[PDB]
Amino acid sequence: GSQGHDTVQPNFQQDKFLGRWYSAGLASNSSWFREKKAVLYMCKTVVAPSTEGGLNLTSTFLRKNQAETKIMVLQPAGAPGHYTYSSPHSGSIHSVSVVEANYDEYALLFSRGTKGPGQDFRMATLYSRTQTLKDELKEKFTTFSKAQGLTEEDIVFLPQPDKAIQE
Numbered sequence: 001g002s003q004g005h006d007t008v009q010p011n012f013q014q015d016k017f018l019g020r021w022y023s024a025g026l027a028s029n030s031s032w033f034r035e036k037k038a039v040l041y042m043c044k045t046v047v048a049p050s051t052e053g054g055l056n057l058t059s060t061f062l063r064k065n066q067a068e069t070k071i072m073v074l075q076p077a078g079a080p081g082h083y084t085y086s087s088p089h090s091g092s093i094h095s096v097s098v099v100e101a102n103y104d105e106y107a108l109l110f111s112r113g114t115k116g117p118g119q120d121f122r123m124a125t126l127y128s129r130t131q132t133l134k135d136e137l138k139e140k141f142t143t144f145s146k147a148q149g150l151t152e153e154d155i156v157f158l159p160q161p162d163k164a165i166q167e
Helices: 137-147
Strands: 018-027 042-046 055-062 067-076 082-084 093-101 109-116 123-129
Touching: 018 067, 018 137, 109 137, 123 137
Parallel strands: none
Antiparallel strands: 018 042, 018 123, 042 055, 055 067, 082 093, 093 109, 109 123
């Protein structure tokens, strides 16, 4: 019947979206995020294969000030676009999956956080693919999130490309 979006895009190939990708779409209720978004930097995530047999995601925040390199590893869970970002040995964990992409641009992922007994977190990840922000993704990401019970209270977009040069 009526259902979709939340599901994962069947048959996905990261090799088609490999390389550097700009960000500009994220949905998370949060509470103290404002204290961090106040200085939101350009999210430049890099996808690549990790050791053993997983994915090595290198995050880099580019702003007018400087750049910060973060480390994010995505280990394949089983289906093309389903991984586990756990860490402990019993509890306090979270996972993320792939929603859908626009042929070869604007990546949309779904996050299901639940660290501890059960917090029940629902965050969304959306990547950009233009000079500026893309409404198509702004709409599809927010509409899917808001249509399923949400709104501006759960939306945060990252700045556009930063620092052209690189030291």
